[PDB]
Amino acid sequence: SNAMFKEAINNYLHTHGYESIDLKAVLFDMDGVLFDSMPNHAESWHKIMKRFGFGLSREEAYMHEGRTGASTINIVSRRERGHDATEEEIKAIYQAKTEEFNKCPKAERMPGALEVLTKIKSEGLTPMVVTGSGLLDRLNHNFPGIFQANLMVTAFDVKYGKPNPEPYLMALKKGGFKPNEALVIENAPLGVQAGVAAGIFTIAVNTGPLHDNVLLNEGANLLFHSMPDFNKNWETLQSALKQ
Ligand SMILES: [Mg+2]
C-alpha cells in the first residue's frame, strides 16, 4: 500500500510536528498479536466472572482487551452493584481466572508473527513486548532470541494499563526511544487508544471478532486485516517510513 502508507505517515508527522519517523523500535502487543491467546482469555474471563456472580460476555472481554483485571472487574461491579469490588474480591477473581486460563496454557503463535519479528531483528531494529498481561521463557521458546527482559513491559512494570498510554511510554523510556522512532502494533481498541495517546505511530491488526471500525475509531494510523497481512507488507512499510 505504498501511497496509502505515505498518507498515514505524513498525517502523523504533520499532527505531531515531526520531520520524519526514524525507525529504531517496534513495540508489539502480546495477546492477539504474538500469540493467539484471546479466545482462551475471553472464555476464562467470561466463565470466572460468571462464577463470582458477574455478567461479562466473551465479546465484552474482547472490548476490555488490555485493561487491568481490576479495572475490568470494577466496571462490571459498578454497573451491577453500584460500587467497586473489594481488594479481596479482585484478588480472588484474578487468581481463579489465571488458573482457568492455565487449563489450556499453550496459545499458538500468530501466523506471520515469527516471520515479521525475524525481519525486524535482521534490520537492526529493536523489538519490544508491551502487555497488560500478568512468560519470557514462553516468549523465548516461540520467538528465539527476539525479545529482551530489559526491553519488555508487563502488568507488573506499570501502575496504569491500557487505554492509559503508560505501558507504551514505559516502553519508550526503557528502550531509550523517542515517539517518532517507534511503531505500536496493536489488535484491540483500548490498546490502539493507548498507543495513539502515547503519540507513537499506531498500527492496528484486526485478529479478533470485532469490526475494523472499533480499531479505526481509536485513531489507528494504519490497519491490517491479519498478522500475515502485516508481515507481507513489512518491507513496503519500512521503505515508506525511511525518509
Ligand atoms: Mg491484544
Q: Spell out the SS3 assignment of the chain.
A: CHHHHHHHHHHHHHHHCCCCCCCCEEEEECECCCECCHHHHHHHHHHHHHHCCCCCCHHHHHHCCCCCHHHHHHHHHHHHHCCCCCHHHHHHHHHHHHHHHCCCCCCCECCCHHHHHHHHHHCCCEEEEECCCCCHHHHHHHCCCCCCHHHEECCCCCCCCCCCCHHHHHHHHHHCCCHHHEEEEECCHHHHHHHHHCCCEEEEECCCCCCHHHHHCCCCCEEECCHHHHHHHHHHHHHHHCC
31 is in an annotated binding site: yes
Grid coordinates representing 27?
A: 513495540
Query: Would you say 29 is a known binding-site residue?
Result: yes
Instruction: Compute the distance from residue 29 Cα to the ligand 1 centre, in Å.
Output: 6
Give all strands of the β-sheet with 201-205 in edge-to-edge order.
152-153, 126-130, 25-29, 182-186, 201-205, 222-224
HSE toward the beta carbon, residue 161, CA cutoff 13 A: 20
Both 164 and 145 in a single domain?
yes
Examine the domain organization and report whether 102 and 213 are in the same domain.
no
Strand pairing report for 222-224 and 152-153: unpaired
What is the distance in A from the centroid of ligand 1 to the CA of 191?
7
Same domain membership, residue 232 and residue 115: yes
49 and 149 share one domain: no
The count of other CB atoms within 10 Å of the CB of residue 176 is: 11
**Could you tell me the distance, in angstroms and rounded to a whole number, from the CA of residue 55 to the centre of ligand 1?**
22
**Which single residue is written with the C-alpha cell 502487555?**
131
- Dihedral sign of CA atoms 120, 162, 190, 91 in order: positive
In degrees, to the nearest 5, what angle opens at C-alpha 123 toward C-alphas 122 and 127? 80
Q: Which of 189, 5, 193 minimizes the C-alpha distance to 13?
A: 5
**Ligand 1 centroid – CA 38 distance (Å):** 8
Q: How far apart are the first and last CA of the chain?
A: 17
Show which of 108, 138, 166 is a domain's final residue.
Answer: 108
Q: Ligand 1 mean position to 60 CA, how many Å?
A: 14
On whether 221 is known to bind a ligand per the annotation, the reply is no
Together in a domain, 91 and 202: no
What's the domain count of the chain? Answer: 2
Give me the sign of the Cα torsion angle 39, 44, 45, 51: positive
Which CATH number goes with the domain that contains 94?
A: 1.10.150.240
Distance 35 CA to ligand 1 centre (A): 9
Cell of 185: 502494533
Biggest alpha carbon distance in the chain?
55
**CA dihedral sign, ordered 214, 125, 151, 36:** positive
Resolution to one decimal, Å: 1.7
Indicate the angle between helix axes 113-122 and 227-241, nearest 10 degrees: 20
For ligand 1, the distance from its centroid to the CA atom of residue 44, given in whole angstroms, is 15
Phi, psi of 29 (to 5 degrees): -60, 155
Structure determination method: X-ray
Beta partners for residue 28, in sequence order = 129, 185
**101 with 173, same domain?**
no
The response to whether 84 counts as a known ligand-binding position is: no
Q: Measure 68 CA to ligand 1 centroid, in angstroms.
A: 12
Strands 25-29, 126-130: parallel, antiparallel or unpaired by DSSP?
parallel
CA 15 to chain CA centroid, Å, is: 23
Domain that holds residue 158: 1-37+111-243
202 CA distance to ligand 1 middle (Å) = 13
Q: Does 234 share its domain with 140? A: yes
Q: How far is the CA of 52 from the centre of ligand 1 (A)?
A: 25
177 and 202 assigned to the same domain? yes
Say whether both 224 and 243 belong to one domain.
yes
